Paper text:
In the canonical pathway, the IKK complex is composed of two catalytic (IKKα and IKKβ) and a regulatory subunit, IKKγ or NF-κB essential modulator (NEMO). HOIP is the main catalytic subunit of LUBAC. Although the catalytic domain of HOIP is sufficient to synthesize free ubiquitin chains in vitro, the nuclear protein localization 4 (Npl4) zinc finger 1 (NZF1) domain of HOIP plays an important role in the process of linear ubiquitination through recognizing and binding the NEMO substrate.
In the crystal structure, a NEMO dimer binds two linear diubiquitins on either side of the UBAN and a HOIP NZF1 at a region upstream of the UBAN domain. The NZF1-binding site is distinct and separated from the UBAN domain by ~ 25 Å on the NEMO coiled-coil axis. Each linear diubiquitin interacts with UBAN through the Ile44 hydrophobic patch as well as the C-terminal tail of the distal ubiquitin and the Phe4-centered surface of the proximal ubiquitin. The HOIP NZF1-binding site covers a surface area of ~ 516 Å2 on the NEMO dimer, involving amino acid residues ranging from Gln266 to Asp282 in the interactions with NZF1. However, unlike linear diubiquitin, only one NZF1 binds to NEMO in the heteropentameric structure (2:2 stoichiometry for NEMO:diubiquitin vs. 2:1 stoichiometry for NEMO: NZF1). Notably, the ubiquitin-binding site on NZF1 is distinct from the NEMO-binding site, and amino acid residues from HOIP interacting with ubiquitin and NEMO are not overlapping.
Residue numbers in the entry:
A (entry chain C): 2 to 148
B (entry chain G): -1 to 150
C (entry chain D): 260 to 338
D (entry chain B): 260 to 340
E (entry chain K): 353 to 379
Write the structure that this text describes.
Amino acid sequence: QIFVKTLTGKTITLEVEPSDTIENVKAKIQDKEGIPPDQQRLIFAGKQLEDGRTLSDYNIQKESTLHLVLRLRGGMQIFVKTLTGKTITLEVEPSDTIENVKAKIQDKEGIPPDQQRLIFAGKQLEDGRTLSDYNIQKESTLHLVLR
Amino acid sequence: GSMQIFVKTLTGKTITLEVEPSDTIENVKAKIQDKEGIPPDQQRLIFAGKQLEDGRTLSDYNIQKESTLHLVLRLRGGMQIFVKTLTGKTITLEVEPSDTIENVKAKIQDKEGIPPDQQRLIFAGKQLEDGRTLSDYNIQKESTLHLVLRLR
Amino acid sequence: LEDLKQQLQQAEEALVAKQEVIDKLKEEAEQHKIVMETVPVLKAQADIYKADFQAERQAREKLAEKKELLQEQLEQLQR
Amino acid sequence: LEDLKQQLQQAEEALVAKQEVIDKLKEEAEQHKIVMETVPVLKAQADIYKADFQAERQAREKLAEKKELLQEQLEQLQREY
Amino acid sequence: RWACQSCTFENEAAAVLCSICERPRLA
Ligand SMILES: [Zn+2]
């Protein structure tokens, strides 16, 4: 149906029959590119779009390109303190598993998810255990250490 | 006067300046803190497709007479301290250590709408009186002030 | 008759020249139009990153608050 | 030799016309270029606002440091014995 | 009677331009 560019980076294309909703457009992007909904803002004809107002609303049909701007800030940033006291931030979602979180730490600090080991509120965390499954509120601090 | 230049924000807000053959960049931001009062650290200046660094001069990146410079307002300055009203509201301010308290209070006015006559600042126990700079009361960055009110 | 013929062949040889310059200006105009489209986007990019820089500030405010309310629960316990 | 004249007067009615259009494409091209000078600036504006959001993050990153340091000093002073 | 080698239209020899393209004889 429709095309999408990423700040003169990648091009994508999507199937959505265009009575489709903005959140369920962004989701079909998080499918393609794994960039979390909250961290993209979509633009047509100079203007940004909102969740409630849909594709049919802004009169957007076939082969029509859509410009994508990567947001910087996430929904739900947390923290990581260490022994040294060197302090880091992550951007994540309540649905994200720990095997996932570690890979983001590796991304910034270059250390493998094999050796990384995380602790919160007197409890060592194992993986495939969502953040709701460790009662992680927003702006939590996880103590972390090596093996 | 040997020469002059023009300087624009993003809108139509055009200004003009007096600068010699070769004055350093910080000096030009300082002539802006002399016509617009925007602190040096809160501006970055652009020519061609490039920003202009602090240490270097105008002769060095080719500037001839009555060329234009594009100006972008930064979003935050060197220092930020905090102010905690008895309401249970804490708001944030932008400063530099050389800034006077009468300066600071005028910024509190600008956000909460209350005049610096009927204001007083206090820090870690004891009373701030004015003229004196932030550096002169030993105010660290991300250090917090309590605030309270006066009459007449 | 056949002296005016000499100049109506230059006249349409001039239309050829003129068109050629039309073509190039149009061709060109379009290459520049590609770069003029990004503009509207970048203007937005700015005003996303902005509202976000703001959003981070408001996260700080509310943290630094917690911290002053702690350095008064520790300012009491000094016996 | 009525069409021959009628067509040299139609010919240059056209070469005036196609000049006037070439004038408005040039005039245009100019303005086009004055919109193309903003882009270098806006590409910066982005990268400033960015680097700022960063330097603000770093501030917030570090504050949290102070904040366990406080909560931890108040787990220390809370168990007075 | 010529065909404008842009839109290939059977045009009158009388016309210096196209009836569609505003485009000359020789291009
Ligand atoms: Zn034709």
